[PDB]
Design a protein around this nucleic acid. Structure first.
Ligand SMILES: [Mg+2]
Ligand SMILES: [Mg+2]
Ligand SMILES: [Mg+2]
Ligand SMILES: [Mg+2]
Ligand SMILES: [Mg+2]
Ligand SMILES: [Mg+2]
Ligand SMILES: [Mg+2]
Lengths: 175, 84, 136, 104, 55
RNA sequence: CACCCCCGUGCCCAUAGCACUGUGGAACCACCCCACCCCAUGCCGAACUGGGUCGUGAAACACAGCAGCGCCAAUGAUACUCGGACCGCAGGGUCCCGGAAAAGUCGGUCAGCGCGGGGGUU
RNA sequence: AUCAACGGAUAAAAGUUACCCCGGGGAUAACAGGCUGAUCUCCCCCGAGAGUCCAUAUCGGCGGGGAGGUUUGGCACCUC
RNA sequence: UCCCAAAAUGUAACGGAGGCGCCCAAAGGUCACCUCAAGACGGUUGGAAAUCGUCUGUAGAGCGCAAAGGUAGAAGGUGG
RNA sequence: UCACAAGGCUAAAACCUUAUGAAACUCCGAAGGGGCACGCGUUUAGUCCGGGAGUGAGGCUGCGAGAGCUAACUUCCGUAGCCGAGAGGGAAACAACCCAGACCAUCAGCUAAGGUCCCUAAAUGAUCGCUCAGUGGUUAAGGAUGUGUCGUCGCAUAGACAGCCAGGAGGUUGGCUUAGAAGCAGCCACCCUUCAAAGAGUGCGUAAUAGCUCACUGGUCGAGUGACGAUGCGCCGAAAAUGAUCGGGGCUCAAGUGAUCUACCGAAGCUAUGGAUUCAACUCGCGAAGCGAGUUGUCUG
C-alpha cells in the first residue's frame, strides 16, 4: 500500500479514485491520502485482525492496523480511513470475527446456528500475534444451547474484553 | 338542556402574552436600579452589586459595568465591576 | 405495526439516514435509496412475503418500525379543527437505513425474498452483504 | 451535618456587609478563632489555644477570645462577622464571643 | 484595491444594497480606489459577487 | 515559599470524584470517657452540648500508590450552515466559498494555586 | 362586576318574514368554468393462492406505480 | 404554561396539549434545626407497598394546584 | 421522559450485550442572530419639536414551519425580493421569474439577462465526445442481448462458452405422505457404487409409468467467453373529447446534447455630445436677510 500527498483541503483528491486517511499512536499523527481501488482489494482480505505497511511518497515505512472506517450513507463506498500505528510489544483491544465449524446436531431437528456476536473485543492479545479469525466448533450443540464468551478457546496469551456469561453462538428452533 | 357535557372537550385556542430573558449584557454600562435579567428561577444568580427581586429579576445595586461568570450552568452569575 | 402508548399527532421534514448500520443481527440486508413514509401495512406485506419464502425457521429482522401517526379528511369541510387521529402509522425512512435483514438463508434465497419484498415497497431498494463493524 | 458549616458560611454575606469574618474551630480543644479577610485569600489576626492552654481546655473560653480582641487592636480591626462553624452558639463559643465583644 | 460595480443592487438584499452605498458606488460601472483594512476589506467581501475586484 | 508535616480557612468547585490498596497516635485531629446541671433529643447525650484523661488509630480523617470504572478529550473526516449559484412535477437533491459540530478514536488525569496559626530536622 | 361577549354600548330587551323593501358585495355561498385530484373512473407492476396437474387459458390476497378529469368534494380566481 | 416559534425579543390558524376565576392566621416574618424517591438484604399484626434496621443514592422526591424554569450550601421537612 | 428492534436472563420489573425514533426528549451543540464598546474606516443618514396626510382588503416566488392529501393559482405565520406604485430588454404571448430602476434630445458607442440556420439582430463558429429516438419538443413503479465508457469475480491453445455425433447411471418405483406420488402436488436428507462421466435430480408431459432433454463426460473445430453490478445518452411502459404543431419553418449532411474556447448581437443599464431641473458649497449684484444670475459636483420611475 502506497500513500501520496497530505493537504488539509481534500478538493485535489476527491474528484479522483483516492480515499482520505489518518494514522496515529501518541508521537506522530500526520495527514494522508491513498488509492480507493488498492485499499479495497487489501481491506476486503485484512479488516481489524490484519495490518499492512504504508510507505508515503518520500521513502518512510510504517506498520499500521485499521481502527475505524467511515463510508457514504447513500453509496456503499468508503470515504475515509483511520489507521492506528502498531507498537511491536503490546497493543489494544481488537474486534475478531467469530466463525463456525462443522454441522450442528441441533441444526438437524429443525434448528439454525445464530452467531449472536459477529465480532469479539479481546483484551491483551499481542501485536503481529493478532488472530485473523476465531473458529468455534458447534457439533456438540442442540436446540436451546447458548455458548457464552467464557467457553471460547483463545489463541495463546489473549484474554477476554467482554463478560464471560454473554451469548456469542446459539442454536435456534423453527418458525 | 341535554345529558351530554358543559364545555366541549378537545381544544386548541389558549396561549398567553409573556416576555423574559437577559436585558443588559457583558460589557454594558449600568445605572443603579437597571434590570439586567428577567427570568423564571435562578438561571443566573446575583453577584457583586447585583440584587434579586421577588420574581428572580436581576438588577443593579450600584452603577458600573456588567460582567458575566459562566462556571458551567447553574453556577451562572452577573456582577458589576465598578468603573469609578 | 402500531405503537402501544403515545401523544396522538405529528408533523413532517427530511435529510440523509441517521441510525442505520449495514450488518447488525443478519448476514444480508435491504437498504432504502429514496426517502419515504413506510405504512404499517407495507412492512407487514414485506414480512409475510419473506416469511412465506423462508417457510420454517424465522430469521427476519425488521430494523424499521412504524411510529409516526398520519391524519385524514372525514369526507368534506375545512370549517372545523385539526383531524383524523386513527388514519395510519408510519416509519420515516431516509436513504441508507437498513429496513430488513435475513439470517440462515443462502445468497440466492435472500436475493429473491428481497426482490419480492421490493415490489411491495413505495421506494427503490438495494440488496447488501457484510464488512461493516463501526461501534460495539 | 457538613451542611451546617456551608449553611452559616453561606449566610456570611462576604463583601455586601463590608466587615471581616471571625472563624472558630471548637470541634476539638485547640480552638483557632481567626480573623479572615473577605476579598484577599488572607487571614489577618487569629488566636489559638495549643500555645499554652492555661490548664483549662474548654474553660480557656474567654482566654482565646481576649487574646484575639487584643490582637485585633494591634492591627486596627474594629468591624467583625463571627462564624459558628457547626457550633450551636451556647457555651465554649458563646464565651469567646463576649470575651472579644468586650475586648474590642 | 480597485473596485467596480458590475451588477445591479435591484433584487439584492437590503444589507448588500446598504454596503454598495458605504463603498461609494451609485451606478453600474462606478469604479474607485479602495483601502486595504479589515473593515474596508470586509465590505468588499460582503458584495464580492456584485463587484469586479482587481488586486 | 529554608525544609517536612499537621489543624483551620480560601480561590478553584471531577484532569479535583469513587473503588481497591498501604503508612500515620500519643504534636495535631478523630473516636473514647462520664453527665445531675448550662443546653439538647415530636423517643434515645445518636446528633447537638458540657467536663476530661487514659485506651486505641479500629471507624473517621490526612497522606501515598494505582489508570478497574468515572471525568477530561484531540488530529482527521463527516453532518449541518452564512453568502454565491443551480437540479427535480414533487418528496427531496447538487456545486463554489468561508464558518463548523455531536459521537467516536489517539490520548490526558487519583489536580493546581494562596493566607494564618501549631508541631518537628537529638 | 360569570359588566365571562372578560377595554366592559342602556338602569332596563326575544322571535319571525315565502308578503317583503333599500344600500352594497363576485370582498361571500348556490350553477357553470378554473386550479387540485383526496373520492371517483380506468390501466400497469409483483405473484400468495384459485385452475386434476401447471402463478399468468381465465381469475390476482396482502401490498405497490400511473393515467384521466365524466363523480362527490376541496379551494373561492372572472362573472351578484 | 408548554409546543408550533425558524438558538435574542416578538410572531398566525375553528393548529397540537393542559390549567386558572382560588387557597394559606401559617402554606406569612425571622431565628434555629432537619434532608428526599427508589432498590437489595434481614425481621411483629404483616408479607405486592406499609412501621424498623443497616448498604447503595444530585435528587431519579418534594414544592396547595397546570406546565415550564428553578432548587438539597434549600425554595423541601420540623419548632420557638 | 415516552416510544421501540434482536438475544441473554429471571418468578414478569430490573439489569447486561446488540440496535433505534422524538414538536411538546436532551449528555451535547453549530452556521447564524441579537445587546453593548470601539471606530482603529468607508459611507450618509439619525434624533427632537411642531403643521398636513394617506394607509390599517395585499399578491406572487425562493427558503423555514403549521393546517391540507409533503393537493390547490389553497390557507396561515416567519423571512428575502419583486408587483402593488415599475416603464425598458429576455422568457412565443405572459403583474410576479432572469437582467435592469426611464430628466430631455441623437439616423453615435460598450454591455447584462438572453441570444447568433430562415421568419428574426448577431459564428450554418472552433475542438474532443455522446444520442438516431424527432429523444431533444408529455411522469412513474416495473421492464429490456439499445449504444458509449470505467470496474468486480470466474472458466479457458494443459484447448473453453455455442452448434454438431455418441452416452447419461444401478440400488431406486430414496423412504414417508397418501386412492397413487416412481427425477418433477407436499416433508427430511442430497449419503453410496461403477468411472471418461452420470445431481436420491431442471423445465415440459400422462392418472401414476414411460417419453422428450439439461446438470456431468469424450470426439471434431479452433479462438476469448460468461455472470453480477456502477454510470452517460437513448427504448418500452405513454388512452380524451373542434385542427394540428418544439412559437413556426425546418434540423441528425445537428439548427439535439456534455466539456472547453474566442467573436459578434442585444436594454430607457453604462458611455459620447448637447441641454434643463433639484439640492449643496464656492463668486458677486444690493442699506441687510433674501432672491437673482454664474461655474463645479450632484440629483430627477
Ligand atoms: Mg465525552
Ligand atoms: Mg462567504
Ligand atoms: Mg444557501
Ligand atoms: Mg423549482
Ligand atoms: Mg464546506
Ligand atoms: Mg363550483
Ligand atoms: Mg415517484
Amino acid at each position: 500500500m502506497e500513500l501520496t500527498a497530505k493537504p488539509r483541503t481534500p478538493k485535489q483528491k476527491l474528484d479522483e479514485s483516492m480515499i482520505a486517511a489518518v494514522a496515529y499512536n501518541k508521537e506522530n499523527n500526520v495527514s494522508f491520502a491513498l488509492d480507493r481501488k488498492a485499499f479495497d482489494r487489501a481491506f476486503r482480505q485484512q479488516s481489524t485482525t490484519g495490518l499492512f505497511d504504508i510507505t508515503v511518497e518520500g521513502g518512510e515505512t510504517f506498520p499500521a492496523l485499521v481502527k475505524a472506517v467511515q463510508m457514504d450513507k447513500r453509496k456503499r463506498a468508503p470515504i475515509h480511513v483511520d489507521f492506528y500505528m502498531v507498537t511491536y510489544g503490546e497493543p489494544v483491544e481488537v474486534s475478531v470475527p467469530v466463525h463456525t465449524t462443522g454441522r450442528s446436531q441441533g441444526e438437524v431437528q429443525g434448528g439454525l446456528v445464530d452467531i449472536v456476536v459477529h465480532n469479539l473485543q479481546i483484551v491483551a492479545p499481542g501485536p503481529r500475534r493478532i488472530p485473523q479469525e476465531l473458529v468455534v466448533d458447534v457439533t456438540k450443540m442442540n436446540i436451546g444451547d447458548h455458548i457464552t464468551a467464557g467457553d471460547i478457546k483463545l489463541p495463546e496469551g489473549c484474554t477476554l474484553a467482554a463478560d464471560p456469561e454473554l451469548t456469542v453462538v446459539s442454536v435456534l428452533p423453527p418458525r | 338542556a341535554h345529558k351530554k357535557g358543559v364545555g366541549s372537550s378537545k381544544n386548541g385556542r389558549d396561549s398567553n402574552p409573556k416576555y423574559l430573558g437577559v436585558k443588559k449584557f457583558g460589557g454594558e454600562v449600568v445605572k443603579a436600579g437597571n434590570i439586567l435579567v428577567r427570568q423564571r428561577g435562578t438561571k443566573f444568580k446575583a453577584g457583586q452589586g447585583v440584587g434579586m427581586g421577588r420574581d428572580h429579576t436581576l438588577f443593579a445595586l450600584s452603577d458600573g459595568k456588567v460582567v458575566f461568570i459562566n462556571k458551567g450552568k447553574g453556577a451562572r452569575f452577573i456582577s458589576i465591576e465598578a468603573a469609578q | 405495526k402500531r405503537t402501544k402508548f403515545r401523544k396522538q399527532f405529528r408533523g413532517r421534514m427530511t435529510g440523509d439516514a441517521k441510525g442505520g448500520d449495514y450488518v447488525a443481527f443478519g448476514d444480508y440486508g435491504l437498504i432504502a435509496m429514496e426517502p419515504a413514509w413506510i405504512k404499517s401495512n407495507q412492512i407487514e406485506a414485506c414480512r409475510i412475503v419473506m416469511s412465506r419464502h423462508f417457510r420454517r425457521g424465522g430469521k427476519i429482522y425488521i430494523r424499521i418500525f412504524p411510529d409516526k401517526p398520519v391524519t385524514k379528511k372525514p369526507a368534506e369541510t375545512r370549517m372545523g379543527k385539526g383531524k383524523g387521529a386513527v388514519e395510519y402509522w408510519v416509519s420515516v425512512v431516509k436513504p441508507g437505513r437498513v429496513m430488513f435483514e435475513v439470517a440462515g438463508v443462502t445468497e440466492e434465497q435472500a436475493k429473491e425474498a428481497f426482490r419480492l419484498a421490493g415490489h411491495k415497497l413505495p421506494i427503490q431498494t438495494k440488496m447488501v452483504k457484510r464488512e461493516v463493524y463501526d461501534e460495539a | 451535618r457538613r451542611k451546617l458549616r456551608t449553611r452559616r458560611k453561606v449566610r456570611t454575606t462576604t463583601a455586601a456587609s463590608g466587615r471581616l469574618r471571625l472563624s472558630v474551630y471548637r470541634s476539638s480543644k485547640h480552638i483557632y478563632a481567626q480573623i479572615i479577610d473577605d476579598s484577599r485569600g488572607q487571614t489577618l489576626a487569629a488566636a489559638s489555644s495549643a500555645a499554652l492552654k492555661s490548664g483549662n481546655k474548654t474553660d480557656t473560653a474567654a482566654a482565646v477570645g481576649k487574646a484575639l480582641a487584643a490582637a485585633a487592636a494591634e492591627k486596627g480591626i474594629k468591624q467583625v462577622v463571627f462564624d459558628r462553624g457547626s457550633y450551636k452558639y451556647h457555651g465554649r463559643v458563646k464565651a469567646l464571643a463576649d470575651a472579644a465583644r468586650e475586648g474590642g | 484595491m480597485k473596485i467596480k460595480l458590475v451588477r445591479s443592487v435591484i433584487g439584492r438584499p437590503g444589507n448588500q444594497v446598504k454596503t454598495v452605498q458605504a463603498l461609494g458606488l451609485r451606478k453600474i460601472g462606478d469604479s474607485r480606489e479602495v483601502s486595504d483594512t479589515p473593515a474596508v476589506r470586509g465590505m468588499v467581501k460582503t458584495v464580492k459577487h456584485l463587484l469586479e475586484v482587481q488586486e
